[PDB]
A paper describes a structure:
The EEEV capsid protein consists of two domains: NTD, residues 1–116, and CTD, residues 117–261. The capsid residues Lys81-Arg114 in SINV (corresponding to EEEV capsid Lys82-Lys112) have been implicated in interactions with the RNA genome. In the EEEV cryo-EM map, the main-chain coordinates of the genome binding capsid protein residues Lys82-Lys112 were observed to be adjacent to the capsid CTD. The residues Lys82-Gly99 form an extended network underneath the capsid CTD. These residues form an extended coil that contains a high concentration of basic residues and structure-disrupting Pro residues. The current map of EEEV confirms that the density into which Lys82-Gly99 has been traced is indeed a part of the capsid protein. In EEEV, the residues constituting the RBS (Lys97-Asp111) form a coil and a short helix. The RBS was located on the inside of the intact NC cores. This implies that exposure of the RBS requires at least a partial dissociation of the icosahedral capsid shell. However, the icosahedrally averaged EEEV cryo-EM map shows an ordered main-chain for the capsid genome binding residues Lys82-Lys112, implying the occurrence of repetitive RNA-capsid interactions across 60 icosahedral asymmetric units.
Author numbering:
A (entry chain F), D (entry chain I): 91 to 261
B (entry chain C), E (entry chain C), F (entry chain C): 82 to 261
C (entry chain L): 85 to 261
Write the structure that this text describes.
Amino acid sequence: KQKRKPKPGKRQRMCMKLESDKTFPIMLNGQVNGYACVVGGRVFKPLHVEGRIDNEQLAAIKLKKASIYDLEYGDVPQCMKSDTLQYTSDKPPGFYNWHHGAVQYENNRFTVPRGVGGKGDSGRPILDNKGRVVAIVLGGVNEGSRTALSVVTWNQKGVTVKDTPEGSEPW
Amino acid sequence: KKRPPPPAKKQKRKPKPGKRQRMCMKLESDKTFPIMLNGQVNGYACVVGGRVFKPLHVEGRIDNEQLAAIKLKKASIYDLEYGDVPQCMKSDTLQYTSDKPPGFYNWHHGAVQYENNRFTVPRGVGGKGDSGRPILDNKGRVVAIVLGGVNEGSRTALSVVTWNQKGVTVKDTPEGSEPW
Amino acid sequence: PPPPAKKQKRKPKPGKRQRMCMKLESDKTFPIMLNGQVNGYACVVGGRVFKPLHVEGRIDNEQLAAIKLKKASIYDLEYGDVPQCMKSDTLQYTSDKPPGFYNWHHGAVQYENNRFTVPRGVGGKGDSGRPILDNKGRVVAIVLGGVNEGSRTALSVVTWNQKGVTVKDTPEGSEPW
Amino acid sequence: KQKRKPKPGKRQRMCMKLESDKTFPIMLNGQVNGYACVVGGRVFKPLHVEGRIDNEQLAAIKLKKASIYDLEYGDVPQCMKSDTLQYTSDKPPGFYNWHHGAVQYENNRFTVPRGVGGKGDSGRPILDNKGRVVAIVLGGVNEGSRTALSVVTWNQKGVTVKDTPEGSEPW
Amino acid sequence: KKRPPPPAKKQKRKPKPGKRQRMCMKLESDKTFPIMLNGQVNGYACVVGGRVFKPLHVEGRIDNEQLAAIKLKKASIYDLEYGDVPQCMKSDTLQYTSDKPPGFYNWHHGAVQYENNRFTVPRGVGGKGDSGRPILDNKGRVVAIVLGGVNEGSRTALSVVTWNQKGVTVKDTPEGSEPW
Amino acid sequence: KKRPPPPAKKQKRKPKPGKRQRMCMKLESDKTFPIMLNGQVNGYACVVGGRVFKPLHVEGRIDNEQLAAIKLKKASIYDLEYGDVPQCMKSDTLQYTSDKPPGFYNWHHGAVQYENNRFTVPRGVGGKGDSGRPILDNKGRVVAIVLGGVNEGSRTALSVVTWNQKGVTVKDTPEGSEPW
């Protein structure tokens, strides 16, 4: 409850920025297990968890099997489609947004510190500080000092392609 | 047994000649570790951006149970060893680039610069006991690892293992480099 | 409460007419959402509950979502009742219609031309099934639909006649809400 | 420091432990028909009461009809298991706790006054001044000025009952 | 390098909230010793009133040459090991009783109490890495040694190995206890 | 963490009874090293003027990788071992003479003098655990190394291994010397 007069800025540019974004978890236990986030025209529900979406018009969608991606893609109604997560395709090396931390981009691998994301949280999008998603996390993986996220991103030709560091965790 | 909050016994006096700790402060902060043959230091070993570059020429054990009890095969075409690095020394250790500009890179025993193609340090660097040193930026970014190279008049020219402009791992070596 | 949280309360206290939305505090209809989007509401009246046939979902109240209704085709609704907590139906009965202004959820309608009437586009898609309320809290008319009337906008309602017998009051070319 | 009390009687006035050890209601279409919780790591839900537990993790427990006990027993998971309270083998003759008032042990019978209880929430356990579960209450008839209830007292040996005095109606 | 007779760098300030060091001061003063598998602590081991209770489930070496180079057979019916304790860790180490009242016993990661039959600590105790902990009195007297036991809502219920009221070495164990 | 140039925590007070540190200051400054059998000190070992005199009676390892991993044969006619000393412990370690005058020589557990032929220290010296001690001058010059010898009333007479007046390595030994 400390109220001094420092520099604000959400520390660090995720605290409202992820929270305003429409990523909706519902577990069978009524909690998070893996995040369905609306991305452009489609929502990316995790394939390898069990649960639904915190929206009646999004959880009632039938979603197609992206075993290519370890997620599921499906329709997003227009009542969500404007306020979907606008994306970006590029990924320069830099600090990006994570609601538990931050990735620093390195060697096509997005790296939160150890124990920050990966397990029980993934599908949380990775946001630009300019405010764009690069990638959707699948789970894992502990890289010791840090933790590289197994992500699903666009490439240089803008192709939605799953990345998997070896031995990654299932969500 | 008293209670100050004391800063800095050694090297934070108010008179500073300079702040050229880029060859000392980052290099000790690197995850480099000696290959001590019966305690005798015959070359340092370090994890570089992924795989570890253990000196294949140098025998002895390393200050890491994740590295010393760890069998590595032979890059005898370069006199190197690879990794096989466990995850606990992954995600930030000795990032780099493949190229080098004609600029100031470093290690433990001083800094390196050369005009065209190669690497040279001033005379008195030592190639024995130390070699196996990554060649970091003022940013802290490797370009090579020391193979030695003889003292040459004013400056010790270096042999290294390094990378191509195409990123291909190569070795730069003058005639009659120094052992490790 | 450090910025205004209504505890500084207010200078203009009730020195004039009370409100027109105190009877919308008695709005015991429910936001019938077919997949998160309100198509209509479920109107209790006399305990006998209904909702328009144009509307699917249905109901955030688990009670009213558990009662199978009966289709009234030429009233464009499906009717049933509310079991075992029935005086939640504050939405009681009007039939008497003096040509005045009766409370509706986006402002009071105008009654004239045997018709309840809001201004231009005051309705919205979702305003089907809304009750139209007396200043006694009594509910006269249940919005099936409506149609724009240039300066104002009609309301196709389920209301009653002078005998109090139900009527699908419908303007020509009315559309759902 | 949050009490704000001028001079209260120093007694556990049926909310410090009793509302803290709240026994979860059994609602059926809004109308609460009983209470139900877990004591001793085994679920109790009254057999004379239909409806739904507050907890999803308890309402998903398939229960076994103890027909000579008017309870539908099963097993809690870990999720509450430590909070499933307490008992020591005694029935001291005197006033006990109650989620509306007080009940008196008298002649192997629980004497609560009239009006208090006997309504339609019939699963509250009588609690001790030690907070120990005394008796899950299932029925009871107004014995005029006072009221005896259908309870589980377990016994002097800790062995369960359906302790129903005569004429007692399941509330 | 000066000459005071100084007391207590760390924890003898004049403000004291309490004196509940019975779970910390005696327990470190106990002759308990970690089983560190390659340095990684996977369970402590301790001499209790005679024989040592080495975790049979846990591999690694112990901080005692009188205990680590010392072969112990299998109480796999309880997942324990016995002693075989040399005399240098005999005559006072971890006295005990067989029973337990419904009262406050302890270890490293907090205190334990339970109403009837068993042992429960609050949630967050850890069963991994620590288990092999003796359960001492405020007097300092064991009643059990931790087998684990899952977090259960508010409190972590425990599995232990313990003793009968007849003194018979038994195990108390909930369904699905935690490993070590 | 402060900055004095401080002298001498322990033993440089201004009151001095004497300066008889010739049995303690030189002897610790000697290159003597314990033979610790499982850590238990059963005799010191030292390089003397060349070859090392390892106690052949005493088992265990030595605080020197140049001495402990170093196989030495048996002078069982004297119960000694020889050297085989690497050059890093050569050129000044425990110079000596062969003779002894009836004078004050020393080690760790006190000083030695005897009238005619032999060596005796006062009672309470210990022969167990320590023996393998060189017998230095106030100059710092060996004449023998302790074999033990029993407490004899007032003074502990000693057995040693020593040298002849002709320099021949011999042993002086009373009847029933002490083990090591």
